[PDB]
Amino acid sequence: VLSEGEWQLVLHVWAKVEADVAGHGQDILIRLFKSHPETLEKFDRFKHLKTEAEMKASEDLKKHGVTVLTALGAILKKKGHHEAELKPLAQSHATKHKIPIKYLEFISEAIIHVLHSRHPGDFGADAQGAMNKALELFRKDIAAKYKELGYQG
Ligand code: HEM
Numbered sequence: 001v002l003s004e005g006e007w008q009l010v011l012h013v014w015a016k017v018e019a020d021v022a023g024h025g026q027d028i029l030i031r032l033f034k035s036h037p038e039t040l041e042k043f044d045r046f047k048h049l050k051t052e053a054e055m056k057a058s059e060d061l062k063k064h065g066v067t068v069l070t071a072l073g074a075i076l077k078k079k080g081h082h083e084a085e086l087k088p089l090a091q092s093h094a095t096k097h098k099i100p101i102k103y104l105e106f107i108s109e110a111i112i113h114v115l116h117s118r119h120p121g122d123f124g125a126d127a128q129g130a131m132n133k134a135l136e137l138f139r140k141d142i143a144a145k146y147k148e149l150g151y152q153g
Contacts (some may be wrong), residue, residue: 002133007079009130013115013122014076017069024114025065030055031110039103072111076134082141090145101143101152108135 002010017024030052033040040047045064049055071089075082093099112131116123123131146152 002080002130002137006130006133009127010076010134011079013119013127013131014073016119016122017115018073021069021073022062022066024118025067025069026056026062027114027117028107028110029061029065029068031113032107035110036103036106039106042097042099042103072138075138080137082138086138086141086145090142091149093142094146094149094151101139101146104139104142108132108139111135 029046033046033049033055034052040049046055046058046061049058049061055061071085075085078085093104112128112135115131116128143152
């Protein structure tokens with residue numbers, strides 16, 4: 001459970017992300033795909049992309065980055081009270097998209113790295129630890145739904 005002070009650190013940096021949702025979404029998905037190429041293979045929509053320049057030039061990838069970060073921002077702003085938001089996301093990601101929890105760990109690393117690059121003054125160690133806790137809570141709660149449905153592993 002995050003404290004109020006931890007949530008304030010999380011949402012303070014997230015308010016900075018929302019100034020350029022699309023650029024953050026690009027940087028995060030590209031980092032994910034470069035650092036963990038198995039993740040790109042899960043996207044029929046993107047797996048034709050073979051270089052970082054092609055990824056950066058894809059408007060559709062930019063659009064999807066906004067989709068992803070909008071969903072995450074709505075979860076973070078619930079401060080843990082996010083059951084309604086996680087139900088459909090866990091269902092689609094477990095049963096339709098077939099995304100292991102481990103890949104949610106990978107995107108969480110990518111998010112933290114990009115926030116550190118873009119917002120160092122609002123993403124010191126205290127905020128890094130708080131965002132790591134928020135993303136762990138996200139994964140814990142999604143993992144419980146995966147387990148219900150027979151997909152935790
Ligand atoms: C912060 C974590 C993530 C969030 C908030 C998120 C959010 C979303 C949302 C809102 C959608 C569209 C609605 C839906 O299908 O549920 C979507 C689609 C999808 N996501 Fe995620 N996602 C996350 C992580 C991942 C990861 C790590 C992968 C793959 C490694 C992945 C793969 C997919 C795929 C394949 C689709 C469908 C894309 C398409 O063909 O249109 N997601 N995601």
